[PDB]
């Protein structure tokens, strides 16, 4: 698994793969690893499939529910709280790693991480997963304040590609999405739309 | 380990056990009694572990006891064996697991005799004679050896003896002191104690 | 750790020693393992002290509320099993215990001996403790239902004494007492160190 | 395991419009003889047998529910069951305890009381049964029976040659199982009268 | 243990093998699988085979509730919700593994499901001991918008190439589809292997066992 | 215990010669960390090799083999050693360093041409060997073998380019169904005219099931 | 690690007045897969004794080159071929050598008596053998044990003729005995050969059955 | 297993059964436990089969050698303390091994317990394996040093068949031999079945 | 199971065992021998496993008599006892080690009697009394009650005879027959085996 | 631990850290992890410093010695081949890592890979240690075909720098070395001189 999430002026963009692994056989090379919570708030899932997709689910209904009667389009603080507690509570029962990022009226774009034991912070871009540790120096170096849109994009796309082919455990299509004030736009890279580096050869 | 022998007959029933209560080098009684007496015409012969024997023993001879008082007349030996059995297999899957090994000799006037055998896992068999302990090992092949339906009542105890002497010879526990017991139509006797010198 | 204990024509006569270890670090040499349950009743400590204490003095508790509401005293045998059925709820838990019960009823003298497994005995003859091999090999040459008083008392020290020199986990004093048909009384609190004198030693 | 701490062994088989039902006699503690008079066949109603294998215990005890239950169902609603509600009914039971089970696996053999044609039905430890058109078996040596009885059962079989080929399959393989045998037993039903007998086998 | 399940243009086919096996000795040779969890939905399922027959029989009922309630006939999502909590609830103590699938008002619908509550909406899925060798099948002759007698004849390839490969899978073959105005459920679909013949007998005379005592009790 | 690893092998054989395929990932654990080696030898003018498993000890045996052959060629007495000896050599080196607790890590796949027939073999850890017309190691055990059986069934006799193709087809399925593969291997014939390898070869690949 | 494997394979041996027949399946496992199907487990020693072997393969082969190998040394140091009965004797202490790292073979031979008759011996790993009629050892003993005993035994069976063996009848009864332990067992399939030792030599035959 | 020996005024008696089991399948009933060392010497099978033939067939060849050697047949108690001092140098690997010598010497009659752990002892009444427990009982009550040779046979019969009755890991048939002051001979050879029916 | 005691006077010693084996549930035999005899005023009682105790006594037994066969005179117990201790300690630390316990009880004409003990660690004590086996914890006491150093010989035997009744009356093993021996300044003498009905 | 070398047309490069654990404690923060082998070849040493050292010092005597009798200097597969004999018989060593650069006449700028184990490869560009994963993309994104001296360097220092950020187990100051015909240039990184980035 590997995620990618990263913040610019007026939304956010965000990245995933699509493999799904259980030892060394591949059960899917297709699944969707974005997960939306309401009109203009997403999610990233990672380690285990069933935990984060019933936490998912749970956080969905909840903030429909407190959306409906306040009447007013919820804040991303809301649910990276909710998700916070319910990952707290059962530190020792799940193994979810997730990210949350969005946008909202009051505040633009925003990103928060949420590992394994349930803590919270926000940051100007955020990465996940097993393939993450093969890129922590490349998205050190090329980061700068002032991103567009389509830099965003094309950035999470060329560090998805360089998780993608060190690391056994991901690899197939690169899934992005991206969110504004108008609306959300998705988009999907594969074959010789993703990019490519030349071997070394002696 | 202890010793329990059982044996049926025509229109009698015979039983027989050890007299000794010690505790890993040396034993600290020579008189003990492992006969429970249950009703007018029936017993329980319990064997095992500490503190599991009499707690059982005791539980089962109350509610007997207030089956008789209540209804006014008595259980029959199998009524009894099926209910200690039930109760024990209840037992079992608890939180106050008993280990216990049992026979429960008696007599009605309707069926007759009945000399049953029961495991610590609430089995529930049927058998003419029957044994525990290790030293059943030196004494069951004998009783398949001399045993006859239709044998007499001081057969019985002649072949009770020369089945005890044989524990004097080859087994590596002392046991010198035996209690017996008779059953039959008038009702629980008490006989001499097969004593061996020493 | 050693006990001893054993009834005859005048009575039971009851003794232990004075030694606590933990390990091989000898705590205290001044115990009293004799326990007083009551004008009526005596005790015994073996294995582990807080619970030959605490689960004794529940029942002294319990002995005292059952006089209260029968006006009649208590016995032996319903002592012992309402030890035994009371300490019973916590088998298989970490309690160890061993304990003589000695007094006298309208049936007479009374010893019983209790453990935390389970088993309730009476006997004539009891020894506890890890010296109560060497205890028994000597109390078994010289008991006799028709002893006298004095014969009695040398026949307990010795043995205490004898049990005393070979195992290390026991010695100190030989407190020695005596039950009545009227209630008990104390005898005398020897000290090891001039028996030795006294006896071929 | 704890299965075979006591041990024993049943097997069914069909006819043409007869059935039959098999089981061993013997009661032990692991290698020792008790006794030999031990029941492994029940009557669940006319033209209906169940077998029992494995705990004694456990045997016992789902006999005794199983008619406790029983008798409730035919005095409710006046009617003899069918095998198949039977079938479903046991499994149900077994399930219930799917943790603490009972050590045993059943064996159903009987007939139809509106069309009398035949019914077998094999379960397990919790269920998964296995209606088949064949025979079934139950206990610790199946090897063996499976292989007997695969050889035997021609499609179409009288009583006959039905008692004798089941007869002579269950004799052939207790005497390969240590823990089983001492003597065997075999209930035959048709539609207007049932056949019970018991057979000359090796008492070691 | 060789299930698969497949996709084509007006519906959904779905197939599995006839054998069980309890450890290592056939018990049966036509067992079945695809199970029914309402008119136009249909589960097979692998597993422990217990825990895959209750699970299956408590969603149908469920079911057959919420349309008498309702009105209307059911839908896919609801037993794929169903099961996905169901399973999630016991921590993965439920071996229920199944290729859950069916067509309702919306176009056909292909699921599958795991024993902790992880769900996929794969266009063909396999499973069991056996699932690769019809997989592999699957990703060489597969195709989109493909017709019925094309589809029946890849999923039983893809059934027996996984039959006379693995040793825990072999019997006669299965078959289901289900279209808008068509549930043609084929057993058996065809049968690859058979018993061979006899070539001698074992004289089953009659009055060659002994006996010792007999019993006989009239019926009326 | 056992580091840096190689995946599956494939074997085929058609009517003049022999054909084999195999990556070039030098694993270890989860991280690809070699791209570029070769996991296949050329033995004799009629004999190859192919291993999966450690590399270490496939260098032991490579090394082996090749002073061997140098050691038997120098003689000159018209002799040569041929696949089944190489075959009863290497059963016989694992079963004794397997009797003595320290083996070798490896399933290996011979190939040869003899005299006007053909060969293929196989090689475990433990000494179990034996032969086959085709065959394949690690997981395409799995995805492989199935198709290479069913196309044989029909018709055990196959042209070079009828075999080529169906090798090219089935080095496909690992990539899409297996984890520790990559998109980079080679394929080697031996024929009357000796043993040829090829360079480093690509699947055409399909993605068209991601929109739906 | 765990230096032994499971592969199956059943074996069985008739003995007759004139005659001795030795059986076995054709296939070769490990696990849930099929490595091959054209493995035979039934070898010639010499002119009137073979054998079979069943369990792991690698000892198997190893013991078969051992006992080839020994022979021929007896016939160069005594200049005589080398009996059944001396077969036996030897291979109970080949076995016995192994009384701590010991082979995982169940082996059985069959062969002609030193006159005319025929001869089996079964053994075990550690090389108790003793002599016999009809044994069936392997994976799918309990299957096949049970019922050489009732039809050539004639145990159960009162009022039965004795009616000694013959040729037809026992290679008929074999070929319906391994055709019915193949639908209950799934490591034995998809063949079967036959050797049969006779006054006159040794024949071979094959039989098909299902592919699972 | 189950296998018995005794002695008395015309010498030494042996008796065993014919079972084998791997587990709980039987895999032959047919077995020879008592084994026939020398024309003089006898001997016993019960734990490990393969031990038990292997060693005493060293025995014997070693008996041969001394007789060659010496120009005088050994004796009991010499064969016996080389069997001990043989399998004494394998404790602690495996080895299971209980066995009966039995002979006739210069003087008189012989007979010696043996096993793996080391313990070698004489005596006159023996019985190991399974069902040794339940032969014992027959065996002492029924014993006596003046008997005939008409009697001990069925004593050892009866002994071997009711150890079989209750003990699963033995049965089948029963073999039985008689040592003298020439040599040894085979006596008899009966099968449970067959007997069941000349008891009740 | 086992049990071996000895007992010294001013001109005499008396050695006493059991004689009883067993495997595990039934006791085999009824008039075994745990004694020893290294020469004509030394006796080795020797007990523990089971096929250690005749390897060791065998051996020190061959040495002796090879001692005095080698030099013209006997060897004195106080000698026998170290030779014993440092072959025991000596194999103690080796790939066969002996598990077994002993007693060394002699006489010498310059010296007088003796007796000794051992632990199975070669510890080599030397005591006016001893004993082995479990048995020893309920007939020590006794000795230490009624033993003097100037005990004659009957008074001895009478004191033996009233240990072995309270093992017979406290242990939970039978033991029913015992074997006894005598050594003096002429030589070993054995007296008749104290039996109990 | 973190070290990388790299391979331009006429020579070679290494770099590594200057950092020692013993736990969680630094027992030192100064070390050298470039140990010569003869006049132009170079070891890189990772995992236990005992057995890399021991067998650093029996490879340095082997090679002197055969570099005296045939008078002729040696090679990098030589060396390579030693080390590959050394830890492959024992591979109780757990002596783990080690990269070999260096320069021969016949050949270039030559580097190797020995590995855990006791396998050997030639690469362009090699990197190992704890901290190496936290680097390989920024490598796949940065290498190409004909790169001078100046450009290897300062990668190098990059890569370097960005690794002893992420990683615990590596810090302190920064040991580079440039490896060619003409001679060896030795130098050191610390403090303002490391390349930083912001945060």
Same mark, same amino acid.
């Given at each position: ?202 | ?11 009698? +029933?015979?039983? /027989?056990? #050890?007299? =000794? ?5 040396? !034993? ?5 009694? $492992? *006969? ?10 319990? +064997?095992?572990? /500490?503190? #599991?024997? =009499? ?5 089962? !001879? ?5 089956? $008789? *008082? ?129 | ?201 | ?204 | ?220 | ?212 | ?212």
């Amino acid at each position: 698994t590997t995620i990618m999430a990263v913040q610019f002026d007026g939304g956010v963009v965000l990245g995933a793969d699509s493999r799904t692994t259980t030892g060394s056989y591949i059960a899917n090379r297709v699944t969707d690893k974005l997960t939306p919570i309401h009109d203009r708030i997403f999610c990233c899932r990672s380690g285990s499939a069933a935990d984060t997709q019933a936490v998912a689910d749970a956080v969905t209904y909840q903030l429909g529910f407190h959306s409906i009667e306040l009447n007013e389009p919820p804040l991303v603080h809301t649910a990276a709280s909710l998700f916070k507690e319910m990952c707290y509570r059962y530190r020792e029962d799940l193994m979810a790693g997730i990210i949350i990022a969005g946008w909202d009226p009051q505040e633009g774009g925003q990103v928060y991480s949420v590992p394994m034991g349930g803590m919270m912070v926000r940051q100007s871009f955020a990465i996940g997963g097993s393939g993450s540790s093969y890129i922590y120096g490349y998205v050190d170096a090329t980061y700068r304040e002032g991103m567009t849109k389509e830099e965003c994009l094309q950035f999470t796309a060329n560090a998805l590609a360089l998780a993608m082919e060190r690391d056994g455990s991901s690899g197939g299509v690169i899934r992005l999405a991206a969110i504004a004030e108008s609306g959300v736009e998705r988009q999907v890279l594969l074959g010789d739309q993703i990019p490519k580096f030349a071997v070394a050869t002696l | 380990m202890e010793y329990l022998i059982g044996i049926q007959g025509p229109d009698y +029933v015979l039983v /027989a056990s #050890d007299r =000794v209560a010690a505790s890993n080098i040396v !034993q600290m009684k020579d008189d003990h009694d $492992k *006969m429970f007496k249950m009703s007018e015409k029936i017993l329980l012969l319990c +064997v095992g572990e /500490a503190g #599991d024997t =009499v707690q059982f023993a005791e539980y089962i !001879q109350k509610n007997v006891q207030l089956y $008789k *008082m209540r209804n006014g007349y008595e259980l029959s030996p199998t009524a009894a064996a099926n209910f200690t059995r039930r109760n024990l297999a209840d037992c079992l899957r608890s939180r106050t697991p008993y280990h216990v090994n049992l026979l429960l000799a008696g007599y009605d006037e309707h069926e007759g005799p009945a000399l049953y055998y029961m495991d610590y896992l609430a089995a529930l068999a049927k058998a003419p004679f029957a044994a525990h302990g290790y030293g059943a090992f030196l004494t069951l092949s004998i009783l398949d050896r001399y045993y006859t339906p239709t044998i007499s009542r001081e057969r019985a105890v002649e072949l009770l003896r020369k089945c005890l002497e044989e524990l004097q010879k080859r087994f590596i526990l002392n046991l010198p002191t035996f209690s017996v017991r008779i059953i039959d139509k008038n009702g629980i006797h008490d006989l001499d104690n097969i004593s061996f010198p020493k | 750790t050693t006990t001893l204990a054993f009834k005859f024509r005048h009575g039971v006569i009851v003794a232990a020693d004075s030694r606590a270890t933990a390990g091989a670090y000898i705590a205290s040499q001044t115990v009293k393992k004799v326990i007083e349950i009551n004008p009526y009743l005596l005790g015994t400590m073996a294995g582990g002290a807080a619970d030959c204490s605490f689960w004794e003095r529940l029942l002294a508790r319990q002995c005292r509320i059952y006089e209260l509401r029968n006006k009649e005293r208590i016995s032996v045998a319903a002592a012992s099993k309402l030890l035994a059925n009371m300490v019973y709820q916590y088998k298989g838990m970490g309690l160890s215990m061993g304990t003589m019960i000695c007094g006298w009823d309208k049936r007479g003298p009374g010893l019983y001996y209790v453990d935390s497994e389970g088993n309730r005995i009476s006997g004539a003859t009891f020894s506890v403790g890890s010296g109560s091999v060497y205890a028994y090999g000597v109390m078994d040459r010289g008991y006799s239902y028709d002893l006298e008083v004095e014969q009695a008392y040398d026949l307990a020290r010795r043995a205490i004494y004898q049990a005393t020199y070979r195992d290390a986990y026991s010695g100190g004093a030989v407190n020695l007492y005596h039950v009545r048909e009227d209630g008990w009384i104390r005898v005398s609190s020897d000290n090891v160190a001039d028996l030795h004198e006294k006896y071929s030693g | 395991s704890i299965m075979s701490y006591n041990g024993g062994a049943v097997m069914a088989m069909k006819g043409k419009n007869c059935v039959a039902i098999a089981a061993d006699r013997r009661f032990g503690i692991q290698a020792q003889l008790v006794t030999t008079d031990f029941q492994k066949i029940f009557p669940m109603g006319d033209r209906l047998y169940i077998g029992l294998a494995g705990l004694a215990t456990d045997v016992q005890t789902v006999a005794q529910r199983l008619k406790f239950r029983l008798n409730l169902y035919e005095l409710k609603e006046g009617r003899q069951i069918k095998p198949y509600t039977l079938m479903s009914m046991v499994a149900n039971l077994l399930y219930e305890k799917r943790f603490g089970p009972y050590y045993t696996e059943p064996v159903i053999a009987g007939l139809d009381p509106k069309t009398f044609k035949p019914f077998i039905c094999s379960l397990d430890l919790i269920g998964c049964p296995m209606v088949t058109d064949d025979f079934v078996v139950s206990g610790t040596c199946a090897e063996q029976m499976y292989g007997m009885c695969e050889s035997l059962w021609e499609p179409n079989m009288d009583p006959d040659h039905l008692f004798e080929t089941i007869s002579q399959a269950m004799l052939n393989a207790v005497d390969r199982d240590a823990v089983s045998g001492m003597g065997v037993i075999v209930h035959i039903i048709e539609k207007d009268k049932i056949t019970t007998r018991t057979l000359k086998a090796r008492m070691d | 243990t060789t299930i698969a399940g497949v996709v084509y243009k007006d519906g959904i086919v779905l197939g599995a093998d006839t054998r069980a096996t309890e450890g290592m000795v056939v018990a049966d040779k036509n067992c079945s699988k695809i199970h029914f969890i309402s008119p136009n939905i249909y589960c097979c399922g692998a597993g422990t085979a217990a825990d895959t027959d209750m699970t299956t029989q408590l969603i149908s009922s469920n079911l057959e509730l919420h349309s008498l309630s309702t009105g209307r006939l059911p839908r896919v999502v609801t037993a794929n919700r169903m099961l996905k909590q169901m399973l999630f609830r016991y921590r993965g103590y439920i071996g229920a593994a199944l290729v859950l699938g069916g067509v309702d008002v919306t176009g056909p619908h292909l699921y599958s499901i795991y024993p902790h509550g992880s769900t996929d909406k794969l266009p063909y899925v396999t499973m069991g001991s056996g699932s690769l060798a019809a997989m592999a099948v699957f990703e060489d002759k597969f195709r989109p918008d493909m017709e019925e007698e094309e589809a029946k004849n890849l999923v039983s390839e893809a059934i027996a190439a996984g039959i006379f490969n693995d040793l825990g899978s072999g019997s006669n073959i299965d078959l289901c589809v289900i279209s808008k105005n068509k549930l043609d459920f084929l057993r058996p679909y065809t049968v690859p292997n058979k018993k061979g013949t006899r070539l001698g007998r074992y004289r089953c005379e009659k009055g060659t066992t002994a006996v010792l005592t007999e019993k006989i009790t009239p019926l009326e | 215990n056992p580091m840096v690893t190689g995946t599956s092998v494939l074997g085929v054989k058609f009517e003049g010669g022999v054909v084999i395929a195999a990556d070039m990932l030098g694993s270890y654990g989860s991280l690809a960390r070699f791209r570029n080696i070769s996991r296949i030898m050329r033995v004799n003018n009629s004999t190859m090799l192919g291993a999966s498993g450690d590399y270490a000890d496939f260098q032991y045996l490579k090394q082996v083999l090749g002073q061997m052959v140098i050691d038997e060629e120098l003689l000159g007495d018209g002799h040569s050693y041929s696949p089944r000896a190489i075959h009863s050599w290497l059963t016989r080196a694992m079963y004794s360093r397997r009797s003595k607790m320290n083996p070798l890590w490896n399933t290996m796949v011979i190939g040869g041409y003899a005299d006007g027939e053909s060969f293929l073999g196989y090689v475990d850890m433990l000494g179990v060997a034996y032969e086959a017309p085709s065959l394949a190691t690690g997981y395409g055990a799995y995805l492989a073998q199935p198709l290479l059986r069913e196309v044989l069934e029909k018709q055990p006799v196959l042209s070079q380019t009828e075999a080529r193709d169906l090798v090219e087809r089935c080095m496909r399925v690992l990539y899409y169904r297996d984890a520790r593969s990559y998109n980079r291997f080679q394929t080697a014939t031996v024929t009357e005219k000796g043993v040829e390898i090829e360079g480093p070869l690509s699947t055409e690949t399909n993605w068209d099931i991601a929109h739906m | 690690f765990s230096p032994y494997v499971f592969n199956g394979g059943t074996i069985l041996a008739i003995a007759g007045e004139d005659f001795a027949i030795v059986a076995s399946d054709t296939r070769l496992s490990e696990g849930f897969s099929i490595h091959t199907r054209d493995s035979p487990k039934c070898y010639k020693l010499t002119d009137k004794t073979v054998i079979g072997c069943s369990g792991f393969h690698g000892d198997c082969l190893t013991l078969t080159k051992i006992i080839e190998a020994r022979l021929k040394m007896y016939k160069h140091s005594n200049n005589k071929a080398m009996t059944t009965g001396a077969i036996a004797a030897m291979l109970s202490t080949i076995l016995y050598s192994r009384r701590f790292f010991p082979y995982y073979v169940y082996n059985i031979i069959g062969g002609l008596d030193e006159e005319g008759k025929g001869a089996v011996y079964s053994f075990d790993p550690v090389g108790s053998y003793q002599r016999d009629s009809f044994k069936a050892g392997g994976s799918a003993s309990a299957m096949l044990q049970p019922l050489l005993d009732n039809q050539v035994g004639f145990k159960n069976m009162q009022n039965v003729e004795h009616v000694p063996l013959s040729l037809d009848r026992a290679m008929r009864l074999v070929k319906d005995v391994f055709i019915s332990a193949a639908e209950r067992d799934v490591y034995t399939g998809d063949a079967l050969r036959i050797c049969i030792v006779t006054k006159e030599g040794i024949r071979e035959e094959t039989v098909s059955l299902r592919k699972d």
